[PDB]
């Protein structure tokens, strides 16, 4: 199974991705947790300490492997090859979850251009097309990491939104981009709903079949965030919601 989780920053996109990763880590023998969003740490949210996460060097910073994979000094390999060498780009969090941190993309200007991007692209592409084990990658609303090439391999794009017009619009934006790109399934996860009014607002703009589930606002996510980190276990009343979301998710995929 290949999943993409997108959402504007602050919507709780990383928290949702981590939750799904935690829950599906028992239906698969391995899962590629891919942090495609620099602004938030999928690693820490997954339970890693700020030290263990930093140590897992970001794809964008493997300046040597980038030079070697895209040819150096002489050649230039427009199509870097990366497969068996994936497990060298991350760390196993445990016997099931392998984490890869993309690292922030750049643009610069006529200096050291396009190389590293073809590197990350190769990784993403290999993860979705060449690899067979479940993959769950989170990303911002721009879903910049996906391409028509990989889009065909994405079983589902999960748009995480909050219960308000703006955010709902962003969700719809994501649905458009994902669609244009060729992803067949785009489902929503409304996070941080605080009252019933919000739930109604949601239903008034989004169809029922397009909604995976709702996650209530909960102080726990804030407390566990900066101490326990085990923010996703029976201990959390929101886990019931994740279970529902996940179950509904597998009903549509496989």
Ligand X SMILES: Nc1ncnc2c1ncn2[C@@H]1O[C@H](COP(=O)(O)OP(=O)(O)O)[C@@H](O)[C@H]1O
Query: Distance (Å, rounded) from C-alpha 184 to C-alpha 125?
Result: 18
Distances (CA, A) of 197 to 7, 164, 193, 202: 22, 10, 9, 9
Compare residues 122 and 191 and give the one whose CB is closer to ligand X: 191
Compare residues 147 and 218 and give the one whose CB is closer to ligand X: 218
Instruction: Pick the closest to residue 45 from 96, 101, 103 (CA basis).
Output: 101
Range in contact with ligand X (rule: CB under 6 A) among 53-61, 114-122, 144-152, 220-228 = 220-228
**Binding to ligand X, residues 34-63 (CB under 6 A):** 39-40, 45
- Least separation, in Å, of the C-beta of 144 and ligand X? 15
Query: Distance (Å, rounded) from C-alpha 101 to C-alpha 34?
Result: 6
Query: Distance (Å, rounded) from C-alpha 174 to C-alpha 177?
Result: 5
Q: Please answer whether residues 91 and 99 qualify as being in contact, where contact means their C-beta atoms are separated by less than 8 angstroms.
A: yes
**Binding to ligand X, residues 97-126 (CB under 6 A):** none
Write each residue from 198 to 217 as x if it is in contact with ligand X (CB under 6 A), else as -, in one continuous string: -----------------x-x
Per CB under 6 A, 239 contacts ligand X? no
**Binding to ligand X, residues 178-197 (CB under 6 A):** 191-192
Q: Please answer whether residues 98 and 32 qualify as being in contact, where contact means their C-beta atoms are separated by less than 8 angstroms.
A: yes
Binding residues (CB under 6 A) for ligand X: these are 7, 9-15, 39-40, 45, 191-192, 215, 217-218, 221-222, 225, 238
């Amino acid at each position: 199974m290949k999943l993409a989780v997108a959402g504007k920053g602050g919507v709780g996109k990383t928290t949702v991705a981590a939750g799904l990763i935690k829950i599906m880590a028992s239906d698969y023998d391995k899962i590629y947790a891919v942090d495609g969003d620099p602004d938030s740490c999928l690693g820490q949210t997954l339970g890693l300490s700020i030290e263990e996460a930093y140590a897992i060097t970001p794809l964008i910073e493997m300046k040597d492997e980038i030079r070697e994979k895209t040819g150096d000094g002489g050649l230039l390999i427009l199509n870097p090859k990366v497969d068996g060498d994936l497990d060298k780009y991350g760390r196993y969090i445990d016997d099931k979850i392998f984490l890869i941190r993309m690292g922030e993309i750049k643009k610069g200007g006529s200096q050291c251009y396009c190389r590293e991007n073809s590197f990350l692209g190769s990784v993403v592409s290999a993860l979705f097309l060449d690899k067979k084990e479940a993959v769950v990658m989170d990303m911002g609303a721009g879903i910049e990491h996906l391409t028509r090439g990989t889009a065909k391999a994405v079983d589902m794009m999960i748009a995480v939104i909050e219960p308000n017009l703006n955010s709902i619009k962003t969700g719809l934006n994501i649905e458009k981009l994902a669609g244009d790109l060729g992803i067949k399934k785009v489902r929503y996860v409304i996070n941080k709903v605080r009252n019933i009014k919000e739930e109604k607002l949601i239903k008034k703009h989004l169809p029922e079949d397009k909604i995976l589930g709702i996650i209530p606002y909960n102080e726990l996510f804030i407390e566990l965030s900066l101490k326990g980190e085990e923010i996703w276990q029976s201990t959390n009343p929101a886990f019931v919601n994740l279970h529902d979301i996940y179950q509904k998710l597998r009903l549509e995929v496989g």
